[PDB]
Amino acid sequence: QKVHPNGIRLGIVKEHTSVWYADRKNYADYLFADLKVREYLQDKLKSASVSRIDIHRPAQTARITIHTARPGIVIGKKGEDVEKLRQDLTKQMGVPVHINIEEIRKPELDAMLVAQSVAQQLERRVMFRRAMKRAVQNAMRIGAKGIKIQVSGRLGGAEIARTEWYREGRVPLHTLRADIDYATYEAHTTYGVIGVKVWIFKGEV
RNA sequence: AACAGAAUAAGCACCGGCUAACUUCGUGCCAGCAGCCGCGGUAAUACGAAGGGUGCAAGCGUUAAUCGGAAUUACUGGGCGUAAAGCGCGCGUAGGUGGUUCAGCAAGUUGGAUGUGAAAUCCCCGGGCUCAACCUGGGAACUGCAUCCAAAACUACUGAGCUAGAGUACGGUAGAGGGUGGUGGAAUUUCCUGUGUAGCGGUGAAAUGCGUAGAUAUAGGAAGGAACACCAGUGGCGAAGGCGACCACCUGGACUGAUACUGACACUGAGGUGCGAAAGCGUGGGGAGCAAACAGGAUUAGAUACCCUGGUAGUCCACGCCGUAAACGAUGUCGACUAGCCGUUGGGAUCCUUGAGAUCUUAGUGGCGCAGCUAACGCGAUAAGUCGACCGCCUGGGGAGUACGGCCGCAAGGUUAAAACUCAAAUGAAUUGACGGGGGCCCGCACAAGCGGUGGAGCAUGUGGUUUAAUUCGAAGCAACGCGAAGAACCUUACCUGGCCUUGACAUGCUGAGAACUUUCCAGAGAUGGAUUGGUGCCUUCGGGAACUCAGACACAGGUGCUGCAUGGCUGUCGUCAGCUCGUGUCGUGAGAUGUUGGGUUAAGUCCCGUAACGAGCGCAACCCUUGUCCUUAGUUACCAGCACCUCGGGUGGGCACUCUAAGGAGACUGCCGGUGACAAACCGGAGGAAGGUGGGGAUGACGUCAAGUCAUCAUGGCCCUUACGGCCAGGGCUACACACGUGCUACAAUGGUCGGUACAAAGGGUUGCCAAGCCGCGAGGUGGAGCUAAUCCCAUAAAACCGAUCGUAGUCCGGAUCGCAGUCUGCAACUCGACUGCGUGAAGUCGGAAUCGCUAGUAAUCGUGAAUCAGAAUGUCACGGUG
Ligand SMILES: [Mg+2]
Ligand SMILES: [Mg+2]
Ligand SMILES: [Mg+2]
Ligand SMILES: [Mg+2]
Ligand SMILES: [Mg+2]
Ligand SMILES: [Mg+2]
Ligand SMILES: [Mg+2]
Ligand SMILES: [Mg+2]
Ligand SMILES: [Mg+2]
């Protein structure tokens, strides 16, 4: 059922989030670094929303480009968090670490940034649909050509597992030529676990 | 009037919907609640409490009892085609209603006057008690009944007329309208007679039956009984039931024309009177076929039934009875108005006349249709439309058209016709689905063609069952059982038996202690306990800090414990099936519907032509990968055509032709030819071409379904354990074992079996590894250490095929299970419990029931090779090639 919309297009649309060659004797000693970096960084940057954390390995050290749509929260008073983490990313990843920060201008057209706001609204006890009818039209005044948002879970009920489904525009999924974003962020309410899926469709080719 | 002092004085029901007003806590299909809907199975806004809140107040609630709401007994104010409801049809008494002109009358009717309709009560305007209830003055009202006066439209009564309703007299047609006799022809059966000789008859198929004691067939004859082909029709006639041979005989009514007469003589009809299909009943006839009851055969778990062979009352006639039917147009009779068109019976017209004529008009009988009505379906001059006159009948479902009583009947029975009790529903028309042993088109190894297996035997593997101290859980039709598990000697591992811990194996905070480290030691199955040379760091505001390790105490830690029906995540399934929806618009009272149907076509909701719909999305197609052709760029470790070289090995120099490798491109679009279609999609052929009509394969699975599976991968709501349901360590266990089922491998031999030679692959792994040459071993191997970080080195010898030999179809020079003995390898350790090797022994098995599965071409069938997991261990899983 609906094979993951990145794993079919690694190639014709998108590329990896981490590029580095490794021998067969060190391949599984760089993965375990790069997988507990991403669990570390998102638990620290719970605010100052983060979409993508890329990692390059040049000759013998590192490079990391953390993407936020609000860089001023992370770079606060000239890198009081930047040099503080750069001391302490080396303690998990023994090479010296670079940290680079870009902007995510138009923050309402990347799926991770959108779906983090859905968990925020649905844990403030906002209505399950008034939160989302406004979170699609706002992401259609500027930008995209199609948006699907599925909201599944407890949805407040007693024994209820309904799925909200609202769509606008055009979203293909069996065209490999197209360009689709995808993100699943969850939510822990005072009862039940709500999972949210987002399918922002940018332009094709 | 004075004194005292805020002192002397607030409950009751309810809070899920109707219905104003809400959340926590107990409880868990228990107790309990309730005016109806109905709540309660472990999170209850409905039960019990607690806060809060709403209604009313000196009262608030329940029960009982009437009228409202109830247009639910409908006078004002309902109904009867299908929801309950039109008698089976006539005739007719009492009664109800009355066409049209005058004239009279005044019984109804209207207007007025008088007498009355007790007072109170109700209503209106006032007046008294500090207000109000309460008391009270004046008026209206009491709808009525009676007596007088007047008016005269309508009804009644009376008197006279009129002909439009109704009836009579006269021509004239059409008819299965009745009753009483008579007479036919075809066919069936029984009987007689001739010829002739082996079956007839029956049915999914048979059997009972009938036959040489001469059947069926076939010809001749006789007797008898009932029905009346073709004409024959939405056709006729009758009050309805009903009525079909031809003729005579009596006999009723309808149509149509002309003309005179009577002058309202009419309509309906409670009671009462008649005619009442068929089955049945009584007495007498009559007995061809058909046929309940019955008998036998068959089918059948069973078959009184369907089907088969027989067969009686009855059906037929006369006379008498019974009175019901889906007695149907599910529609009482009678009268008047309201657009059309196409039929048909019979009858007059007019009309040019030859008509296969024309138009108009009545009496019937059919098909469509506008207004209109209808819940809808549907009726629509033969109303269910608009209106009149009289009658019958209906009041939720069962109980029940039933019981008692009455009247009729020879009998069966019929007609008239209740109640108690019990339920919150019974029923109507129309929608979307689902389903059919209903119909129409289409597709799939779905059948049919073909090859090969499963179930027979042996071993391998899983589940059920059994058993044990534990055989740790989970997955139960296809969708399950070589399944999580891509590896159980211990470890894994959860379970069992013990040994052993309590802030803990681990997290953070607190208090002390020492750097960490190294201790090379004993006890003990180990866990652990105690020795134990040593070590004394590290940054120093030199104060210490941080680092680690030990103890104390608190919050806690931890959980493979329950819930997959509290859920997220991730996968199966229908199904790679061709569908699934929306916007705006119009139709419908509404749930809906249309687009998305029709014709053609397609692997396809793919296209074309059509069309109250016009569009859009998801899907299909393409975009991606791989294989097949060629071109360009590229030449080491790959490559050898040309060149020498050679020791004859691309060995070497060399070459960039090639094969190969991998980058980037072209090629295929029904493009072109012909035919075919509406010439429009497309379809059938044809050329060229490496490839021809989506070239072959792969990934890609729509809206959804099954509360499908998983809390034991992980994440989480709740619930329990927290001196153990948590931790630690030994051995055991999951591999036990009369049995049954699932997949899988070998075999059962001569398209074979051995021995000796000899030929050709792809794909992949390897510096914590591959482990060569030499070397020693019957053999698995042991030495030995190269080469190697990979087109180089190693894994690494492909097997079937071919060639020669023997083997002669024998449970075997077949088959290899079992088992004895002897070895090597990994690992601390091969007892329960590993894999291989040697030697010996040699089983079942001679192609395998009912059944049942896979496959349409490099495919089935058969032969090998590699990888993942991995110290060791594949008949499985995944993957690549031979022969075909
Ligand atoms: Mg007081
Ligand atoms: Mg309560
Ligand atoms: Mg009433
Ligand atoms: Mg009458
Ligand atoms: Mg009075
Ligand atoms: Mg009838
Ligand atoms: Mg009737
Ligand atoms: Mg459809
Ligand atoms: Mg292995």
**Contact assessment for residue A66 and residue A74, using Cβ atoms and an 8 Å cutoff:** yes
Contact A5, A182 (CB under 8 A): yes
Selection from A119, A144, A140 nearest residue A200 by Cα: A144
Specify which residues A196 forms β-bridges with.
A151, A185
Written in H, E and C, the secondary structure of chain A is: CCCCCCCCCECCCECCCEECCCCCCCHHHHHHHHHHHHHHHHHHCCCCCEEEEEEECCCCCCEEEEEECCHHHHCCCCCCCHHHHHHHHCCCCCCCCCCEEECCCCHHHCHHHHHHHHHHHCCCCCCCCHHHHHHHHHHHHCCCCEEEEEEECCCCCCCCCCEECCEEECCCCCCCCCCECCEEEEEECCCCEEEEEECCECCCC
Q: Report how far residue A108's alpha carbon sits from residue A57's, in angstroms, rounded to the nearest whole number.
A: 30
Resolution for this PDB entry, in angstroms? 3.3
How many angstroms is it from A26 CA to the middle of ligand 1? 92
Q: For strand B, which residues in window 5-44 of chain A come within 7 Å by CB?
A: 8, 11-12, 24-25
List phi, psi (to 5°) of A102. -110, 180
In chain A, residues 106 through 165 whose Cβ sits under 7 angstroms from any atom of nucleic acid strand B? 152-154, 158-161, 163, 165
Technique of determination? cryo-EM
Return the structure tokens found at A54. Answer: 């890329």
Paired strand residues for A147: A168
Give the type of residue at A148: K
Written as one letter, the residue type at A26 is N
The one-letter code for the residue type at A153 is: G
> In chain A, what are the domains?
15-105 (3.30.300.20), 106-205 (3.30.1140.32)
